[PDB]
Structure of Spike glycoprotein:
Amino acid sequence: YAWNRKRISNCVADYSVLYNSASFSTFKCYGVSPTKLNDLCFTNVYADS
Amino acid sequence: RLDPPEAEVQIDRLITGRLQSLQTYVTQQLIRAAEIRASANLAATKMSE
C-alpha cells in the first residue's frame, strides 16, 4: 500500500545491463523491444519497486 | 520502437485502412468523371447545333 515510486529525469538510466545483455540469443520484453531502448528519448521515467 | 515480428501487425492495419481510403476516392472520381463527360457531350452538341 506504500510502494515507493521515484522520479527519474534529466538523466541517462541503467541502460547498460540490458544493452550488454544483447549477445544472448533470447530476449524477454513485451512492451518494447529491448534493443531499441537505447536509441530513443523519453520525456520522463518512473521506477517502482 | 518495435521489432520485425511485432511491427507487422500495425503495418498490416495501416495498409488495410489506407487501401480502403484510396479505393473509395477512386470510385468517387470515376462517377464524377462520368457525369462531367455527359455534360461535355451536351455542350458539344449545343455548339454544333
In short: Chain A touches chain B at residues 32-33, 35-36, 40 (CB under 8 Å). Residues 18 and 34 of chain A are 7 Å apart (CA to CA). The longest helix of chain A spans residues 16-20. The radius of gyration of chain A is 13 Å.
